[PDB]
A paper describes a structure:
Discovered in 1968, Escherichia coli RNase III (EcRNase III) is the founding member of the RNase III family of dsRNA-specific endoribonucleases found in all kingdoms of life. Among the four representative family members, Rnt1p and Drosha process stem-loop RNAs only, whereas RNase III and Dicer also process long dsRNAs. Bacterial RNase III functions as a dimer, and thus removing two negatively charged side chains between the protein and RNA promotes consecutive binding and cleavage of long dsRNA by multiple RNase III dimers. Each EcEEQ molecule contains a specialized endonuclease domain (RIIID, residues 1–147) and a dsRNA-binding domain (dsRBD, residues 156–226).
Here, we report the crystal structure of EcEEQ in complex with a stem-loop RNA (RNA6) at 1.80-Å resolution (EcEEQ:RNA6), showing how the E38A and E65A mutations stabilize the protein:RNA complex and how the Q165A mutation eliminates the sequence specificity of EcRNase III. The complex is composed of two EcEEQ subunits (each containing 226 amino acid residues), two RNA6 molecules (each containing 28 nucleotide residues in the form of a hairpin with a 4-nucleotide capping loop and a 2-nucleotide 3ʹ overhang), six Mg2+ ions, 418 water oxygen atoms, and several other ions and molecules from the solvent and cryoprotectant. Hence, the EcEEQ:RNA6 structure resembles the postcleavage complex of AaRNase III, indicating that the EcEEQ:RNA6 complex is also a postcleavage complex. Therefore, the alanine mutation of both E38 and E65 stabilizes the resulting protein:RNA complex and thereby promotes the inside-out processing of long dsRNAs. Hence, the Q165A mutation eliminates these strong hydrogen bonds and thereby abolishes its specificity for the +3 G nt. In each cleavage site of the EcEEQ:RNA6 structure, three Mg2+ ions are well defined and fully occupied. As depicted in Figure 4(a), these Mg2+ ions (MgA, MgB and MgC) are ‘organizers’ of the cleavage site assembly by coordinating with four catalytic side chains (E41, D45, D114, and E117), three nucleotide residues (R-1, R 0, and R+1), and eight water molecules around the scissile bond. The CDMgA,MgB in the EcEEQ:RNA6 structure is 3.7 Å, suggesting that the EcEEQ:RNA6 structure represents the postcleavage state immediately after the intermediate state of RNA hydrolysis. It appears that MgC plays three important roles in catalysis. We predict that all prokaryotic RNase IIIs employ the third Mg2+ ion to assist two-Mg2+-ion catalysis of RNA hydrolysis.
Author numbering:
A (entry chain A), B (entry chain B): 1 to 226
The structure:
RNA sequence: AAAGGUCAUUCGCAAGAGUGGCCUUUAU
RNA sequence: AAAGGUCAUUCGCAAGAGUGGCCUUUAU
């Protein structure tokens, strides 16, 4: 790995590795080598879940376990990890196989998010739980300072079905009416039928559930609930 | 709290609380008080999954993240926590409401398993991460020394469907043929129809998926696969 | 958090290593 | 890991606090 890139990353992360081989392995995707970051990712995911649980427990003494669960999901889900990866410019540091280099793997959300978790595993093994907890809390400071509990942490599909279920109304139906693209790069169009609306609401996305979420968001607005 | 009970538990756990009020809250089920252990359970669950991940990562350097994930599930699932709760005789320390005391709540697996997680949260808040990690590793020493990776950690339903899918055979049909008892205390009977087997295989349990697992277990044996 | 199947797809003579969509199963 | 609905059910005059089965949704 090129030390020009690795030294910049260590500066941005706030952590200089004693064992550079741990950092190299954390940055190595399985397309590049049989010695890759998948075990580190498993370990780092578990550290992250604990650090964020502890942070929410202390920051929000009056909220119940449901609130903390939804807040933690917002913070540790793949989309948020990918955001952090882009903030660290992590794509420049990934060790990828040739197939990935030629297909945009350095921008691939799943690989970026996995590598954030693997870096946490690596920093932990290079130091200790106290050190990596402080590092994660630094990375998350702005998000933890801005997050708030309540139904704003509930996704649109959840909010819509609870709105309907609480009024003994039928659950919405979601139907794929159109798929455009090739089997590996699709755009879905969903039509959502909702009790009380005369027309289906439309949502689009690169997966069916992303399109359903977009459709549920539209239904909530058309129902004048938000 | 009654010192006789508290003193025995602390000897069993291997840990004496500095703040007894944390211990009381950890032992308090929501049937008993509005100040109960649910937030502590959320926190303790996250600590336990980190501690076990770290232990498996170090004890099994050659296994992949799939092996570690299944092994962790075996160790942290509700049935294992309830086992530990029985070993700590936790039922005797639970603080329950009158409805629970009169319906056997001190034996309810969900409540017992939750309280193990809540106590982990409480020890953590009473000390620090390194202390609670040491304690959990003491509690799990015999289980960690005995556990082994491989297909043995896959449940019967998973094993059966992978056998059939890998041979492009139909997945099993799990038919509920009988549900005996009241709606809150039932026995399910499942008939599982498996390609290659003459007659359906029978499973029973207190939940439909428990009955399905029992039937899958029988189907694997009759297929002479195990 | 993982598993399996399937359709497609990047690299590769291949061997083989990946990625996306969909389905099924398990744990938290 | 949590949420909601439902069918039962423990305690309770009730208010209210639980528990089990089933379904739906979300995250890991
Ligand atoms: Cl620079
Ligand atoms: Cl609060
Ligand atoms: Cl942040
Ligand atoms: Cl679809
Ligand atoms: Cl090993
Ligand atoms: Cl007990
Ligand atoms: Cl059923
Ligand atoms: K696939
Ligand atoms: K229920
Ligand atoms: Mg994760
Ligand atoms: Mg992960
Ligand atoms: Mg748990
Ligand atoms: Mg729990
Ligand atoms: Mg994963
Ligand atoms: Mg739970």
């Amino acid at each position: 790995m090129n030390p020009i890139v690795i030294n910049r990353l260590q500066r941005k992360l706030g952590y200089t590795f004693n064992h550079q081989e741990l950092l190299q392995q954390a940055l190595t995707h399985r397309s590049a080598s049989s010695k890759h970051n998948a075990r580190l990712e498993f370990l780092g995911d578990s550290i992250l879940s604990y650090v964020i649980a502890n942070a929410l427990y202390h920051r929000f003494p009056r909220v119940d376990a449901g609130d903390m669960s939804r807040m933690r999901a917002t913070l540790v889900r793949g989309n948020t990890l990918a955001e952090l990866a882009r903030e660290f410019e992590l794509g420049e540091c990934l060790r990828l196989g040739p197939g990935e280099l030629k297909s945009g793997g350095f921008r691939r959300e799943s690989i970026l998010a996995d590598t954030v978790e693997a870096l946490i595993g690596g920093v932990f093994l290079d130091s200790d739980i106290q050190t990596v907890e402080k590092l994660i809390l630094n990375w998350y400071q702005t998000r933890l300072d801005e997050i708030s509990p309540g139904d704003k942490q509930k996704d649109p599909k959840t909010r819509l079905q609870e709105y309907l279920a609480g009024r003994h109304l039928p659950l919405p139906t979601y139907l794929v009416v159109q798929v455009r693209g090739e089997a590996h790069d699709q755009e879905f169009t969903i039509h959502c039928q909702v009790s009380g609306l005369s027309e289906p609401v439309v949502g689009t996305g690169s997966s069916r559930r992303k399109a359903e979420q977009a459709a549920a968001e539209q239904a909530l607005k058309k129902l004048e609930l938000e």
